[PDB]
Write a protein that binds this ligand. Structure first.
Ligand SMILES: CN[C@@H]1[C@H](O[C@H]2[C@H](O[C@H]3[C@H](O)[C@@H](O)[C@H](NC(=N)N)[C@@H](O)[C@@H]3NC(=N)N)O[C@@H](C)[C@]2(O)C=O)O[C@@H](CO)[C@H](O)[C@H]1O
Ligand SMILES: [K+]
Ligand SMILES: [K+]
Ligand SMILES: [K+]
Ligand SMILES: [K+]
Ligand SMILES: [Mg+2]
Ligand SMILES: [Mg+2]
Ligand SMILES: [Mg+2]
Ligand SMILES: [Mg+2]
Ligand SMILES: [Mg+2]
Ligand SMILES: [Mg+2]
Ligand SMILES: [Mg+2]
Ligand SMILES: [Mg+2]
Ligand SMILES: [Mg+2]
Ligand SMILES: [Mg+2]
Ligand SMILES: [Mg+2]
Ligand SMILES: [Mg+2]
Ligand SMILES: [Mg+2]
Ligand SMILES: [Mg+2]
Ligand SMILES: [Mg+2]
Ligand SMILES: [Mg+2]
Ligand SMILES: [Mg+2]
Ligand SMILES: [Mg+2]
Ligand SMILES: [Mg+2]
Ligand SMILES: [Mg+2]
Ligand SMILES: [Mg+2]
Ligand SMILES: [Mg+2]
Ligand SMILES: [Mg+2]
Ligand SMILES: [Mg+2]
Lengths: 208, 117, 132, 62
RNA sequence: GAUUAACCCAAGUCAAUAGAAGCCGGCGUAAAGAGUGUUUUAGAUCACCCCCUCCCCAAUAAAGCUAAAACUCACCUGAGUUGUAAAAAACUCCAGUUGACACAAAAUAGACUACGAAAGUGGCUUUAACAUAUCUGAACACACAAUAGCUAAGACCCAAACUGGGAUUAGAUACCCCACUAUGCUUAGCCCUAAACCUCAACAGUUAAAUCAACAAAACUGCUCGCCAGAACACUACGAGCCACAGCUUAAAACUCAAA
RNA sequence: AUAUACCGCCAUCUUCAGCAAACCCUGAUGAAGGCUACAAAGUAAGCGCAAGUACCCACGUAAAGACGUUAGGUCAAGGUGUAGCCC
């Protein structure tokens, strides 16, 4: 790294600084003065202070990119968001008067919730006991399950079963199926849940 | 009351048969052993058994077993903090017995002398 | 391991010179150059002909002043001129030094068609930088 | 606090790392106590840029 | 090997052979304290003076007894039990509860350190009972001696060489699983061995001096008995003796090496 | 021909820190060994490391990286010891 340890990561939150001094707690107040002395890294290009910035939709874009082609990864994401948006408007005009109150049209709310329905609760971790490795069920951390949800969605879409379907139409179709707790990505979570509940006899090998 | 050592080891004055056959001389050392890593206690197992029993009944649906999952989730969070707190605090915090590294600095100030000078 | 232009460590009875005590990675940081011409500058030519003259001049002086050279030669070029600067021991008589100066200057001026001048700097004994 | 390499110049004596730490432990102990004015001078001997952006001068055009 | 020079002896030289110089040292691990105890002929000076752990804790022999577990049988219930790193085979009058029930073996105590010559001895009771008023004293006399094993007659819970089956493996005459026998137990005879090793003889005494190769369990003195003198051949061969007949005890040499 | 005579230039452990002269002490003056910071026999030039330097800084990357190890590589870079060929 070209940055020294002294350099600290920057805080892009715009409503944090605005906080009145009267609200500042004694601990928080101290921090603010301390940062003045510290050196701050230059903010990276990826994250701004806009009101539309979504860390989950930016991380999902980075996990699809190939060879640094971010203009194409971002393009696919926005097309997918627009495809989810246009498909729900088509399901909203053709619905009954009382069915329109339960139809979500915001593509973000669908993206975040669909990924939350794929997050597994427990996983299989190899533990060394008696000179052997056992795939014991272990509670996946918050980050791990958030990462797996994204990886599985991108693997399923990349999988070459759909002969000639564009990613935006594939990713949009999988996101709407997981929103209703359907599809393979959800099924893939159950298959990991069926192997952690069959091998529960080895749930004492772990210590932490 | 430390057990006796009269007429225990094979010697010249002792007429009777030996009682003890030590492979290492019975002479105090100037250091103690390092505390051995234990095994640990698995946590959130009861929350993990009632959450996987609900999936079988409900065919692994996360909409009917929501309450059970939180027990297993909230527990993991609390258990994770305890592990971090325990490791750091025990070494830094002074409770009960001392640690070998600090206890061997005390035994090396008062070394055992099995020789004459 | 790297060996080039390095004097390996010894008990301490081996005397080395400043130039002999520094390895190649100090040639422009703690050392200069023994030859200074323009051949190797960007856009200059005749770098291979100034080099052959240096290899021969260092051998001509080593065999023409045997046992008298304390340190390496410092060859300098200014236009047509070529300046040889040397550090020599005081063991040899001055009469013989003047003979070798007029013989080497003249011989090398007719061989390389250029004015050659030689500047001796006698020293009592080989200057020692440190003992490796 | 005076660094090890700078403390061997005041004393002209080679010092180990451990000896330097021992000396620093006594100076810190000295500071915690209610040291007199003279002591502050003694400790000071062994002790050795505002992070503000430089504003550009506002100019005026024709 | 030849040649040159040199060294030693010298009318001799010096290859083979033989002989001449061999005991006051040792025995925890180098070769040596030979499983134990007693005595004899005798030797010693530790025997008179002169003095200090009788008795009791797991000695021995005999007879009797039984708490825990097990086997077996019976009832009731169940449909499996065994086995494990994981399997197979095996068993299915099997398994679990309850109850009745040993010629086997003796948790804790025992962090004790005792008895006995040693071997060895650790459940209860009772009887008999544990040499010697100097020491030493035997491969063979006299008497003992773990385990294993033989012969004969009984017993049988469990374990278990052999054997059979199952598996592993390149193979597996093994390690792992199962089953079962000789055997371990009792009575009566025999056999007579051990890393029978606390590898450190018995008695008496000392803690000073040079402490003392090393390691181990500090180093010595007196006295006596026993044993041992390079390695291997050799816990062999022959001979003798023995209830021992594929045995035990005692126990060489030749060939061979220059080390062990 | 010989890299198993070598110089020379390297590899490697080294994405190390150790190498070592000269002394001293211990062990009864044996081969050997040599630390404890509330300090108990070690001190140490030199070498390397480090620091400096280069590149866009203090960062990072280069470079440097010993003494030894593997009779490591190369007699076909060149030179060279030894033995050999010379119609
Ligand atoms: C000091 N000499 C040591 C000794 O060498 C000995 C060694 O002697 C060997 C005999 O010839 C052989 O018949 C003898 N073979 C037998 N079957 N007895 C070897 O055992 C014997 N080696 C030995 N005892 N270590 O070989 C011989 C040729 C030797 O060099 C004679 O001096 O033994 C050698 C190892 O055997 C060592 O390497 C040598 O250093
Ligand atoms: K023994
Ligand atoms: K080489
Ligand atoms: K060559
Ligand atoms: K050659
Ligand atoms: Mg032992
Ligand atoms: Mg012996
Ligand atoms: Mg004996
Ligand atoms: Mg015997
Ligand atoms: Mg009992
Ligand atoms: Mg007697
Ligand atoms: Mg006899
Ligand atoms: Mg015998
Ligand atoms: Mg017997
Ligand atoms: Mg029998
Ligand atoms: Mg049986
Ligand atoms: Mg078989
Ligand atoms: Mg039987
Ligand atoms: Mg015994
Ligand atoms: Mg005797
Ligand atoms: Mg012999
Ligand atoms: Mg025998
Ligand atoms: Mg025999
Ligand atoms: Mg016979
Ligand atoms: Mg080589
Ligand atoms: Mg080679
Ligand atoms: Mg750098
Ligand atoms: Mg490099
Ligand atoms: Mg460097």
């Amino acid at each position: 790294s070209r940055y020294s340890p002294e350099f600290k990561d920057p805080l892009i939150d715009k409503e944090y600084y605005r906080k009145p001094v009267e609200e500042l707690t004694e601990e928080e107040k101290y921090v603010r003065e301390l940062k003045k002395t510290q050196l701050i890294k230059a903010a990276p290009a990826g994250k701004t202070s806009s009101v539309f910035e979504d860390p989950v939709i930016s991380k999902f874009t980075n996990m699809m990119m190939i060879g640094g082609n971010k203009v194409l990864a971002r393009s696919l994401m926005i097309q997918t968001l627009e495809a989810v948006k246009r498909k729900q408007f088509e399901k909203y005009h053709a619905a009954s008067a009382e069915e329109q109150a339960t139809i979500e049209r915001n593509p973000y709310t669908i993206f975040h919730q669909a990924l939350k329905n794929c997050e597994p609760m427990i996983g299989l971790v190899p533990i060394l006991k008696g000179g052997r490795f056992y795939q014991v069920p272990v509670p996946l951390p918050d980050r791990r399950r958030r990462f797996l949800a994204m990886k599985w969605m991108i693997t399923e879409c990349r999988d070459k079963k759909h002969q000639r379907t564009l990613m935006p139409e594939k990713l949009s179709h999988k996101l709407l199926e997981a929103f209703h707790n359907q599809g393979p990505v959800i099924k893939r979570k159950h298959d990991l849940h069926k192997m952690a509940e069959a091998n529960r006899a080895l749930a004492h090998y772990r210590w932490w | 009351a430390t057990p006796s050592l009269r007429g225990r080891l094979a010697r010249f004055g002792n007429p009777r048969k030996p009682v003890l056959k030590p492979n290492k001389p019975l002479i105090l050392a100037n250091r103690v052993g390092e505390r051995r890593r234990e095994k640990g206690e698995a946590t959130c197992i009861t929350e993990m058994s009632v959450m996987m029993a609900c999936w079988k009944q409900n065919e692994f649906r996360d909409d009917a077993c929501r309450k059970e999952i939180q027990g297993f989730l909230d527990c993991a969070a609390r258990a994770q903090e305890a592990r971090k707190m325990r490791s750091i605090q025990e070494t830094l915090g002074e409770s009960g017995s001392l640690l070998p590294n600090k206890l061997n600095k005390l035994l090396q100030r008062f070394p055992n002398k099995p020789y004459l000078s | 391991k790297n060996r080039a232009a390095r004097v390996r460590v010894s008990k301490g009875d081996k005397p080395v010179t400043y130039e002999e005590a520094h390895a190649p990675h100090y040639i422009a940081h703690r050392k200069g150059w023994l030859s200074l011409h323009t051949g190797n500058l960007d856009g200059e030519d005749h770098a291979a002909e100034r080099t052959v003259e240096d290899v021969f001049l260092r051998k001509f002086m080593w065999g023409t002043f045997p046992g008298c050279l304390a340190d390496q030669l410092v060859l300098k070029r200014r236009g047509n001129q070529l300046e040889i600067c040397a550090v020599v021991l005081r063991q040899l008589s001055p009469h013989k030094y003047y003979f070798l100066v007029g013989y080497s200057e003249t011989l090398l001026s007719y061989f390389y068609k250029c004015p050659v001048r030689l500047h001796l700097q006698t020293v009592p004994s080989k200057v020692v930088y440190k003992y490796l | 606090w005076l660094i090890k390499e700078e403390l061997e110049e005041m004393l002209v004596e080679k010092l180990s790392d451990l000896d330097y730490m021992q000396f620093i432990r006594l100076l810190e102990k000295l500071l915690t106590s209610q040291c007199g004015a003279a002591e502050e001078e003694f400790v000071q001997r062994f002790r050795r840029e505002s992070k503000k952006q430089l504003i550009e001068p506002v100019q005026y055009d024709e």
